[PDB]
Coordinates of C-alpha atoms and ligand atoms in Angstrom, one line a residue:
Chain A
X1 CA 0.0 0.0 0.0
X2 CA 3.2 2.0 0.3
X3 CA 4.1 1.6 -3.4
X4 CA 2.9 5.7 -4.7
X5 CA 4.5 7.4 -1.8
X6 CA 7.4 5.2 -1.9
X7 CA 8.2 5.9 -5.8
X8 CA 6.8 9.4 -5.1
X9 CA 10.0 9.8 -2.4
X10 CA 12.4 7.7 -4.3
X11 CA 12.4 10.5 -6.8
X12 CA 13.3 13.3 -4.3
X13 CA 15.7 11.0 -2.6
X14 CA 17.9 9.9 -5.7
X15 CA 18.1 13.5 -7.2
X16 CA 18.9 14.6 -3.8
X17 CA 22.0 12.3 -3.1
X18 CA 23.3 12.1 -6.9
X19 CA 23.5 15.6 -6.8
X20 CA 25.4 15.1 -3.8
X21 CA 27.7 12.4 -5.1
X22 CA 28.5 14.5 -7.7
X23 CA 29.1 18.2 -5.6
X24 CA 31.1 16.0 -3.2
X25 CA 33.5 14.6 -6.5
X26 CA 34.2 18.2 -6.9
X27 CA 34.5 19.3 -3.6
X28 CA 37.0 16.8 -2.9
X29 CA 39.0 17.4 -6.5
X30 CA 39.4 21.6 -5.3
X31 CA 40.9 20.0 -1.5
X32 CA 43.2 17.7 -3.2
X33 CA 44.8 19.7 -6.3
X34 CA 47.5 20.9 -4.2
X35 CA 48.6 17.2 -3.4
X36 CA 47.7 15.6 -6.9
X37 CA 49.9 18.4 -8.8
X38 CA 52.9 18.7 -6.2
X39 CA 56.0 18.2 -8.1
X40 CA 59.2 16.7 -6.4
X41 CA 63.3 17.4 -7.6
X42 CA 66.5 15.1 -5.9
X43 CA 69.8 16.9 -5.8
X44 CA 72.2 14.3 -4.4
X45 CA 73.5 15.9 -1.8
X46 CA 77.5 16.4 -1.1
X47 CA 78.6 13.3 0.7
X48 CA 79.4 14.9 3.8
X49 CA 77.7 13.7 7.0
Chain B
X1 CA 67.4 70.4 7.3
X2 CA 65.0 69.1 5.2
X3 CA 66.7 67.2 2.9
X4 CA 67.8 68.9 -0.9
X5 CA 67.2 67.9 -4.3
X6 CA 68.0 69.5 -7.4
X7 CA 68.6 68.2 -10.7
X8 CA 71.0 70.0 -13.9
X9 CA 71.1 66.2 -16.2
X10 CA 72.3 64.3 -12.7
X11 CA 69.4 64.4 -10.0
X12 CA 72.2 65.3 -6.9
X13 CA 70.2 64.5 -3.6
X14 CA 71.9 65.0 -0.3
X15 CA 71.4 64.9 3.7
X16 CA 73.1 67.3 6.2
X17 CA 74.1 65.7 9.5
X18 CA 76.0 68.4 11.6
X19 CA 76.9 65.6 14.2
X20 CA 78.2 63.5 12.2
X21 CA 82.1 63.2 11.8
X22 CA 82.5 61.3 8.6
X23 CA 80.6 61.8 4.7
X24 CA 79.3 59.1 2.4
X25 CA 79.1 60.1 -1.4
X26 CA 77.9 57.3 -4.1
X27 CA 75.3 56.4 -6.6
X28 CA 72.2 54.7 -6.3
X29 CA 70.6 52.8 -9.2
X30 CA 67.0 52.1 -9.8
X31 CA 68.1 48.6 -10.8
X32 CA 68.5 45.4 -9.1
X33 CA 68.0 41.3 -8.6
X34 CA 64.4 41.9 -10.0
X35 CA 65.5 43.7 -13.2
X36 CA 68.0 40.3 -14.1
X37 CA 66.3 36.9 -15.6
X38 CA 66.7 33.6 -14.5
X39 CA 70.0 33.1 -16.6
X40 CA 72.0 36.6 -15.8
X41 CA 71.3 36.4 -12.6
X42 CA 73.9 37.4 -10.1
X43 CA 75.5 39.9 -12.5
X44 CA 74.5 42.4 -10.2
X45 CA 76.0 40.4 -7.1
X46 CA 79.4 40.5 -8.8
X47 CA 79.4 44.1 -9.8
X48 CA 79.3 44.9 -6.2
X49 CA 82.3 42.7 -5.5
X50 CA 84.4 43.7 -8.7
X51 CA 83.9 47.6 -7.0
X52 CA 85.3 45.6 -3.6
X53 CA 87.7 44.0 -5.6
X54 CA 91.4 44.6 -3.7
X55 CA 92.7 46.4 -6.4
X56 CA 89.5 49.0 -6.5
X57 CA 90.0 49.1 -2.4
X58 CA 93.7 49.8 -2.0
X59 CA 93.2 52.9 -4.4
X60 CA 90.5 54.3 -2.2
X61 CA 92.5 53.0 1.3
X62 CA 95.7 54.6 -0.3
X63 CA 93.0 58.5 -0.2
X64 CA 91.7 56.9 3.2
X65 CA 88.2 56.2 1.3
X66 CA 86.2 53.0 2.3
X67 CA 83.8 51.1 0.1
X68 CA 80.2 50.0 0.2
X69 CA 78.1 48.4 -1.7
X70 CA 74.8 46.7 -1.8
X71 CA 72.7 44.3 -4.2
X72 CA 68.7 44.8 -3.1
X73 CA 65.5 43.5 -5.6
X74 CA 64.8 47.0 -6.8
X75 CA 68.0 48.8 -6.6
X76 CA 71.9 49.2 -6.3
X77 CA 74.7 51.3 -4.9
X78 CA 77.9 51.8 -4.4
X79 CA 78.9 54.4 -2.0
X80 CA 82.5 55.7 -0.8
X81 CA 83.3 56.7 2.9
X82 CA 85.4 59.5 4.4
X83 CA 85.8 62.4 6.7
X84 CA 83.9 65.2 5.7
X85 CA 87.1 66.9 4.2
X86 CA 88.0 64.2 1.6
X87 CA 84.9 64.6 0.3
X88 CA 85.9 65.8 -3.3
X89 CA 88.7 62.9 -3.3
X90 CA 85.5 60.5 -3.0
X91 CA 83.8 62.0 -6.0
X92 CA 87.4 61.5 -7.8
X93 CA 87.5 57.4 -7.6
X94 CA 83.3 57.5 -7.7
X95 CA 84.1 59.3 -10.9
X96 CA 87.0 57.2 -11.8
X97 CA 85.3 54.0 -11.5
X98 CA 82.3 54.7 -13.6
X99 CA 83.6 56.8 -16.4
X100 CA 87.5 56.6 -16.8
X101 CA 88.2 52.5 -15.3
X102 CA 86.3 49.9 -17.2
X103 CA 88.8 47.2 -18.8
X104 CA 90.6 48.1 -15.5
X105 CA 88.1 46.3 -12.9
X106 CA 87.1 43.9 -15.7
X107 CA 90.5 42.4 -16.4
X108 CA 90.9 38.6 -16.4
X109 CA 92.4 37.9 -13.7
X110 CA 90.5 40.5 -11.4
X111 CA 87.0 39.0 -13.1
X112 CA 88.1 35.2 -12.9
X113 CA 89.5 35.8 -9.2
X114 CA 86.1 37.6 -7.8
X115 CA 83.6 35.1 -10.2
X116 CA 85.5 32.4 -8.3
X117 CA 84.8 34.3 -4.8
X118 CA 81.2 35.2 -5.0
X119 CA 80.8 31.5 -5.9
X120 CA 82.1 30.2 -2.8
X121 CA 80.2 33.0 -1.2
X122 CA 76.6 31.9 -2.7
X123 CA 77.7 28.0 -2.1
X124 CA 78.2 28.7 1.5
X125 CA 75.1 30.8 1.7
X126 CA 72.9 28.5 0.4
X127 CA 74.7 25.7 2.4
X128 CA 74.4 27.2 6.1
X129 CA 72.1 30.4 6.5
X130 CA 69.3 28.5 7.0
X131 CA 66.9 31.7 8.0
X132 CA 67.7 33.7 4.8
X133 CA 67.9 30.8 2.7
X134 CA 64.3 30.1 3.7
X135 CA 63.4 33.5 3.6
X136 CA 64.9 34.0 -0.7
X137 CA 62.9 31.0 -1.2
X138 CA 60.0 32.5 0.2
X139 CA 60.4 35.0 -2.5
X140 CA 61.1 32.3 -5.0
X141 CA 57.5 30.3 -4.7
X142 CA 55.7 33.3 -3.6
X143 CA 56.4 35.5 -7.1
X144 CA 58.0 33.0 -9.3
X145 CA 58.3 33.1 -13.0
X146 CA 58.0 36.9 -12.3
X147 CA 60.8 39.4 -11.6
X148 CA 60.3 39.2 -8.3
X149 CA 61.5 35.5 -7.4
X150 CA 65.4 36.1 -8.4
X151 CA 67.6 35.8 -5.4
X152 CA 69.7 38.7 -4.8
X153 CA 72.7 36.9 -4.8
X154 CA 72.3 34.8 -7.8
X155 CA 72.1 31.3 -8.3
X156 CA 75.0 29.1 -8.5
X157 CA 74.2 27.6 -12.2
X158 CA 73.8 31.5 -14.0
X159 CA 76.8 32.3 -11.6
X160 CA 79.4 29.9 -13.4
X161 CA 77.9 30.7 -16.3
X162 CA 78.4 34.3 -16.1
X163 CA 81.3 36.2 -18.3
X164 CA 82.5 39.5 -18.5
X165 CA 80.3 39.8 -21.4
X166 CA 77.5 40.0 -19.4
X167 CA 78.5 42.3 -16.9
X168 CA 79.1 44.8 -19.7
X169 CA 75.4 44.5 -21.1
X170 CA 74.3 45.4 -17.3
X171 CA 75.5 48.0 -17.0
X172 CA 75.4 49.3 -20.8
X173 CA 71.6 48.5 -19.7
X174 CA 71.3 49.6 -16.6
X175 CA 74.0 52.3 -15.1
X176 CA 72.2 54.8 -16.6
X177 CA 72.0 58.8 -15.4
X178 CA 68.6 58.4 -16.0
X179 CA 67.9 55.4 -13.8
X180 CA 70.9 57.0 -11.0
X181 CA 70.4 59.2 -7.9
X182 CA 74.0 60.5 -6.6
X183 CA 73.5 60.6 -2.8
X184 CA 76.0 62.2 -0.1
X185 CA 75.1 62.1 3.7
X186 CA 77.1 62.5 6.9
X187 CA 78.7 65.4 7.2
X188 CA 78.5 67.5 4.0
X189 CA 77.0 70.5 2.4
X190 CA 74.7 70.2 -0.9
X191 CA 76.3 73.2 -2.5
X192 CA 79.9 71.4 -1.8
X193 CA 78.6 68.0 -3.8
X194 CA 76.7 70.2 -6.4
X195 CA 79.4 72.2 -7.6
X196 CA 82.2 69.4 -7.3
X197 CA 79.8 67.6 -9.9
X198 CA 78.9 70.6 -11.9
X199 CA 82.6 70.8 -12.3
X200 CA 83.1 68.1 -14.4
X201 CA 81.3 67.6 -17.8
X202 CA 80.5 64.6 -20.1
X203 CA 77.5 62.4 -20.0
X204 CA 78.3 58.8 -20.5
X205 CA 75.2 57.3 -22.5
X206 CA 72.8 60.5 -22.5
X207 CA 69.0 60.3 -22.6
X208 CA 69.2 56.3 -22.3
X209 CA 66.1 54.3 -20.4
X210 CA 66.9 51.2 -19.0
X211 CA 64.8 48.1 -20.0
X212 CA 61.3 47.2 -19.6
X213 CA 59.4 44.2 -18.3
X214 CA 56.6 42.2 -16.9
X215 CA 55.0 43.6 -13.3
X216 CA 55.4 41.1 -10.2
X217 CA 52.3 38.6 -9.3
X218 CA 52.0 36.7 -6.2
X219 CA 51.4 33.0 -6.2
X220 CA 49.7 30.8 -3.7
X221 CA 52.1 28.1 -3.2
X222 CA 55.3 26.6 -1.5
X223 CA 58.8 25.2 -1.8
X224 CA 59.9 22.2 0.8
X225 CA 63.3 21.8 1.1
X226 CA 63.5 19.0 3.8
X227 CA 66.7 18.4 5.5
X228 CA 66.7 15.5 8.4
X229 CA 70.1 16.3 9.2
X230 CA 69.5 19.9 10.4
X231 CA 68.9 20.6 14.0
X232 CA 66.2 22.4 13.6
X233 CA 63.1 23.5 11.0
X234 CA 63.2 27.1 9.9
X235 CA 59.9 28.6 8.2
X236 CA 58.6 31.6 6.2
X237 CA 55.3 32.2 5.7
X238 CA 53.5 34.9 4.2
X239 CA 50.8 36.5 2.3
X240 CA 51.0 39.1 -0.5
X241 CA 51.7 42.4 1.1
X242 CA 52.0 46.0 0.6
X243 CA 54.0 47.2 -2.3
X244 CA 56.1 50.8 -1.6
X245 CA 53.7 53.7 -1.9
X246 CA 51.2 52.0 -1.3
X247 CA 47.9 53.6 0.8
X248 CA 48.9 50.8 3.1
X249 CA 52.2 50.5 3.6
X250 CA 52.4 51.6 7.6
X251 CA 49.2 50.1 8.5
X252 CA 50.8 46.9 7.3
X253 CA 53.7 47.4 8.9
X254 CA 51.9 48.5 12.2
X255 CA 50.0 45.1 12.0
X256 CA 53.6 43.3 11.8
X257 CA 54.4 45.4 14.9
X258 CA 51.5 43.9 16.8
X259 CA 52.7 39.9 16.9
X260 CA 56.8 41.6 16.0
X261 CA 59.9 39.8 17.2
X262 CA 60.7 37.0 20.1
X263 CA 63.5 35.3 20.9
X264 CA 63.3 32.4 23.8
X265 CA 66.5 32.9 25.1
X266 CA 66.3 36.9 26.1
X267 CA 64.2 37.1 29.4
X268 CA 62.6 40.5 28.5
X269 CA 61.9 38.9 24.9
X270 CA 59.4 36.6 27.2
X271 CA 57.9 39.3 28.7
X272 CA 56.2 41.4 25.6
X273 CA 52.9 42.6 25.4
X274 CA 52.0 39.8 22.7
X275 CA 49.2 37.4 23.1
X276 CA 50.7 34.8 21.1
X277 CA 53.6 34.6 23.2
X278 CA 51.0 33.3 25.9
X279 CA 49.6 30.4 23.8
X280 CA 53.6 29.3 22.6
X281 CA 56.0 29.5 26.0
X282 CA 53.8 27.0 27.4
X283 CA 55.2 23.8 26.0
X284 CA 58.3 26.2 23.8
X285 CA 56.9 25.8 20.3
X286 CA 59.8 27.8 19.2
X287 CA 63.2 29.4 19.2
X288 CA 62.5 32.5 17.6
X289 CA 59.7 34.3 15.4
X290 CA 59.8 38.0 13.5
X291 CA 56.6 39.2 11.6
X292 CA 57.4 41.7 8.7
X293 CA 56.1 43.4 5.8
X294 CA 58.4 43.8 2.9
X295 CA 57.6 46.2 0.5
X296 CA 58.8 46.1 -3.0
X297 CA 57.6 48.6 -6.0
X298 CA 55.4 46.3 -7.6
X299 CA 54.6 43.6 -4.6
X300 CA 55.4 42.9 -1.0
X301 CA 55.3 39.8 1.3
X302 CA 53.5 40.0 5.1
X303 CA 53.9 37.3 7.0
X304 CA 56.6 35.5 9.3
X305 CA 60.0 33.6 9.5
X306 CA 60.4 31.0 13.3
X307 CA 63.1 28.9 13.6
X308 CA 62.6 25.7 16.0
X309 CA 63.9 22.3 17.7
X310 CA 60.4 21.3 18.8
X311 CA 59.9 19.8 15.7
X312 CA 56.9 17.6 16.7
X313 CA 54.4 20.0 17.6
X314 CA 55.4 22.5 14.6
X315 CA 51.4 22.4 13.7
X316 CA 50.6 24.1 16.7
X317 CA 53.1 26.7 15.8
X318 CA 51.7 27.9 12.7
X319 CA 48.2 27.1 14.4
X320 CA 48.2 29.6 17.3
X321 CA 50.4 32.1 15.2
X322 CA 47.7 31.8 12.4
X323 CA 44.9 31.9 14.8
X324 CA 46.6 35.1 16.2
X325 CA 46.2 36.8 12.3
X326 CA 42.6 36.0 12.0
X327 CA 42.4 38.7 15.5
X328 CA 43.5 41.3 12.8
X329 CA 40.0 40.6 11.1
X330 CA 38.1 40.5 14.0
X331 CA 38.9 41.2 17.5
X332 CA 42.2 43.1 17.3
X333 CA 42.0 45.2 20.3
X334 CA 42.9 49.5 21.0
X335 CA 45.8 48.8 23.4
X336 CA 47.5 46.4 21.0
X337 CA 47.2 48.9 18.1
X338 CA 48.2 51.8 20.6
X339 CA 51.4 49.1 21.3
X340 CA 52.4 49.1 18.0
X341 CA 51.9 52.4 17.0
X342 CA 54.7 53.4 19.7
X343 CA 57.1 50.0 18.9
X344 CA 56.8 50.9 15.2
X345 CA 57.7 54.5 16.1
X346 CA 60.7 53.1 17.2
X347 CA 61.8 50.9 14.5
X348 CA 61.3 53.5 12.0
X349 CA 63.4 56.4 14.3
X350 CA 66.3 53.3 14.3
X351 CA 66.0 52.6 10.7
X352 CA 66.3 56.1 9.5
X353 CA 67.9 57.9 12.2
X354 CA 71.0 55.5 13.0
X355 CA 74.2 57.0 13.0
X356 CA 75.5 55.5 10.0
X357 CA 76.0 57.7 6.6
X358 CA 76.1 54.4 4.6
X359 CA 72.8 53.2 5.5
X360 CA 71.4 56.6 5.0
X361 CA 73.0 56.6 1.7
X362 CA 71.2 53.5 0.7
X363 CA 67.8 54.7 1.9
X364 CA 68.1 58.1 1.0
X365 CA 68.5 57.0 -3.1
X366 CA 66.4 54.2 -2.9
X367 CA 63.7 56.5 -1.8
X368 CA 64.1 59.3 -4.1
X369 CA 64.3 56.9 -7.2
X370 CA 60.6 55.3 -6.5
X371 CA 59.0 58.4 -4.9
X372 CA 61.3 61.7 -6.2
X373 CA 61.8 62.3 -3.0
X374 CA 62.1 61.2 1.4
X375 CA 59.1 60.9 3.6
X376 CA 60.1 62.8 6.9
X377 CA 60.1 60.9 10.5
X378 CA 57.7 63.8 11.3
X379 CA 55.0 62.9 8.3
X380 CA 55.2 58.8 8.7
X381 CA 54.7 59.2 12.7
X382 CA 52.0 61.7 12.1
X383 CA 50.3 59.2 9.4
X384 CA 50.7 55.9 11.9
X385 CA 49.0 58.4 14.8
X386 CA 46.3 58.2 12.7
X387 CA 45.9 54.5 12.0
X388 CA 42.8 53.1 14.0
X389 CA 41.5 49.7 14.7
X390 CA 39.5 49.6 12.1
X391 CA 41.9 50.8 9.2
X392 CA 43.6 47.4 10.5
X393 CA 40.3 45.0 10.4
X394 CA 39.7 46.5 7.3
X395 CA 43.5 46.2 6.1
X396 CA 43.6 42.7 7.3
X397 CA 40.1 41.8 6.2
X398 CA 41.6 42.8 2.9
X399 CA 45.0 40.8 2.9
X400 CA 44.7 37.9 5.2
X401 CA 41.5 36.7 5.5
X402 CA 40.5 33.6 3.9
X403 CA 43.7 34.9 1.5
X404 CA 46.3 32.6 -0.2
X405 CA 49.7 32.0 1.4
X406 CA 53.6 31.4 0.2
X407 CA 55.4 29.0 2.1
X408 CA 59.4 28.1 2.3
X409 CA 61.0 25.6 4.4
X410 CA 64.7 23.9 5.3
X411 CA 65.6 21.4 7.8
X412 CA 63.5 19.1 10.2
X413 CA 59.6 20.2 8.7
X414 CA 58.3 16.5 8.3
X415 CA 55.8 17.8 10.9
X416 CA 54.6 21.0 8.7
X417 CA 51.5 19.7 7.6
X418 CA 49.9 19.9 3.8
X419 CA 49.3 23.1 2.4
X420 CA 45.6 23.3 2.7
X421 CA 45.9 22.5 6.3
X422 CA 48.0 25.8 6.9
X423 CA 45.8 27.7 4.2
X424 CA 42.5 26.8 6.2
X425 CA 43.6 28.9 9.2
X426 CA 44.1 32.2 7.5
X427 CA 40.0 32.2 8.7
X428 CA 37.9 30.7 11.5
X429 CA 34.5 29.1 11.5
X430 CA 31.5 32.0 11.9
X431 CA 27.8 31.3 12.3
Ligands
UMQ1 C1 25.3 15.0 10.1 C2 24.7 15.7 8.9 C3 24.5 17.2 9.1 C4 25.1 18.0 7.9 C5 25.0 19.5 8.1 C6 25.9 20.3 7.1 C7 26.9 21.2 7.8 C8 27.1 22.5 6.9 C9 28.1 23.5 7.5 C10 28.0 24.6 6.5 C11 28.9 25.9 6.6 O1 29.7 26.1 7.7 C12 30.5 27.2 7.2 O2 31.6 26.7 6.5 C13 32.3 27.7 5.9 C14 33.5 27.0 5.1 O3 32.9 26.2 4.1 C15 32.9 28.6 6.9 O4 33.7 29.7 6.3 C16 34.9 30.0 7.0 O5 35.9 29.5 6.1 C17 35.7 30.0 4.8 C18 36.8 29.3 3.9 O6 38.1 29.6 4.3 C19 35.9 31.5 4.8 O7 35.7 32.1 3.5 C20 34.8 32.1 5.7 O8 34.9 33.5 5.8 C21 35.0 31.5 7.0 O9 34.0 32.1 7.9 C22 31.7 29.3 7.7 O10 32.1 30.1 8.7 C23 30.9 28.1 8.3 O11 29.8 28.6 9.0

């Protein structure tokens, strides 16, 4: 007897959370650009220690 | 007693100090580290030491002159010491070495010999002053690819590439009458350096203008230049500041004033009127911390340099120091602005009224080449007077909150934490 409502919320519920899959893909790509584009040099240091 | 400037081809500025018993005559040049690239950098680092060159200073010793020079981002000089009497023999060698001498300095064995001593001089640099190593990196990451990022002192790989050659296009280039300011200070009389210049004639590359090129731009980032072998982890941290001239430029300063300088080991150091210093003495996050504001034509860095062994709690460093900016923004209190209006006062009265010629020499050119002119003691203390605790919330509100950040490091700094980490406290959580 649930089945109308149920649909009726499944419709608000999976717009609500892909939407938030998606922002949260984004979200984390801005927090991690620092880390994902660092760039490292060596220079082997003057044996001397 | 007001400082002269007049102009007939060479602008001639001087500054007349009746207690002082020596005179400082030299030229200032609106060019320096940040009008060199990437691969000619350090040409002006060895110009200054070519002028110090032995041969150059036994002339002047022979007269009783003494040499100084110095190699800043925007410009350069070269200044020559002795008693107020001497002072026409000083514009003799100044004359000398930058009209009559040039294959003279830039002999051979005179360019080989110094080349090969500024190299050792930038290798041990780079290899034990940690604080200003950190600090020209600072630069580096904070305005690189721009003008801006060269060190001062050169790099080691333009360095040995460097040949007379180059030194020549410099200064074809750039020692230019049109991009110079002859200073004299100490003890000596406008009229006296005027006429002693007026007395001579020539021109040496007339109505020349030195080269052009792209304007500064700061650059959220960092440069981590780990070191496990150091005893300690030295750090620079800033965001972009106030450039020279700018509306700015003492309210900035005044805000360095309020968190200044601390060193652990000085008892009255400890005892400041800084809140920070109540939130780090507790568990001794560090050796020693100055605040600044650099100011640079086009740019300028605010921020911080600390040095210290307690290298597992260097997050709560930056935290509490951080945490202490955000205060700028928001709660920044009267007495702490009325503080620093007095302590700033003071480093401005030691800056520009020490009793050295030479260093008034260097300001006093530096200042009339951006400006035309000095700002008086009397006019900068009136203008910080004025600065209230809202021209700092709304200066800092401006340039630190929720504002990008450079960040240089050498030594133990496993325990600096990620960028965005540090980034996230230049603000705090608001309902
Ligand atoms: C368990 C499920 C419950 C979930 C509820 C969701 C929680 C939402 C919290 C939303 C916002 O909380 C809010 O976050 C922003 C950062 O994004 C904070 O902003 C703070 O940092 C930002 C970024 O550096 C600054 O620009 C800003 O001036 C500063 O106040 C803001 O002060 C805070 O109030």
């Amino acid at each position: 007897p649930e089945h109308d409502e149920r649909k009726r919320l499944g419709l608000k519920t999976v717009i609500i959370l892909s939407s938030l899959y998606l922002l949260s893909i984004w979200v984390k790509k801005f927090k991690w650009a620092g880390i994902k584009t660092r760039k490292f040099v060596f220079n082997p240091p003057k044996p001397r220690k | 007693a007001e400082v002269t400037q007049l102009s007939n081809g060479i602008v001639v500025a001087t500054e007349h100090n009746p207690s002082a018993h020596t005179a400082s005559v030299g030229v200032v040049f609106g060019s320096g580290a940040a009008n060199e690239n990437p691969y000619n950098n350090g040409v002006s680092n060895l110009w200054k030491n070519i002028f110090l060159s032995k041969e150059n200073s036994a002339v002047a010793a022979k007269e009783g002159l003494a040499l100084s020079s110095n190699i800043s981002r925007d410009f350069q000089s070269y200044i020559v010491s002795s008693l107020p009497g001497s002072t026409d023999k000083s514009l003799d060698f100044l004359n000398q070495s930058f009209i009559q001498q040039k294959a003279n300095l830039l002999s051979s064995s005179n360019f080989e010999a110094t080349k090969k001593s500024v190299l050792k001089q930038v290798q041990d640099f780079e290899d034990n002053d940690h604080p200003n190593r950190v600090l020209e990196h600072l630069h580096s990451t904070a305005f690189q690819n721009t003008p801006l990022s060269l060190p001062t002192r050169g790099t080691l790989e333009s360095l040995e590439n460097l040949v007379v050659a180059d030194l020549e296009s410099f200064a074809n280039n750039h020692f230019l009458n049109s991009n110079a300011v002859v200073v004299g200070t100490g003890n000596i009389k406008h009229e006296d350096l005027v006429n002693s210049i007026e007395s001579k004639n020539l021109s040496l590359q007339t109505g020349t203008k030195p080269v052009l090129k792209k304007k500064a731009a700061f650059l959220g980032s960092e440069v981590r230049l780990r070191d496990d072998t150091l005893p300690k982890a030295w750090i620079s941290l800033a965001v972009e500041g106030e450039p020279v001239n700018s509306p700015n430029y003492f309210v900035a300063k005044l805000a360095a004033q309020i968190f200044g300088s601390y060193n652990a080991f000085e008892p009255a150091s400890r005892l400041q009127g800084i809140k920070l210093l109540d939130n780090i003495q507790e568990y001794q996050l560090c050796d020693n911390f100055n605040h600044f504001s650099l100011s640079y034509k086009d740019s300028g860095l605010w921020g911080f340099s600390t040095a210290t062994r307690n290298v597992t709690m260097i997050d709560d460093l930056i935290h509490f120091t951080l945490k202490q900016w955000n205060r700028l923004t928001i709660s920044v209190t009267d007495t702490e602005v009325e503080r620093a209006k007095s302590l700033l006062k003071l480093q401005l009265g030691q800056l520009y009224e020490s009793g050295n010629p030479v260093n008034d020499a260097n300001l006093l050119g530096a200042e009339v080449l951006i400006k035309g002119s000095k700002l008086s003691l009397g006019e900068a203390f009136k203008k910080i007077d004025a600065i209230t605790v809202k021209d700092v919330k709304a200066w800092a509100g401006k340039r630190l909150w929720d504002q990008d950040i450079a960040i240089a490091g050498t030594g133990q700094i496993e325990g600096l934490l990620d960028y965005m980490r540090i980034r996230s406290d230049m603000s705090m959580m608001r309902w």
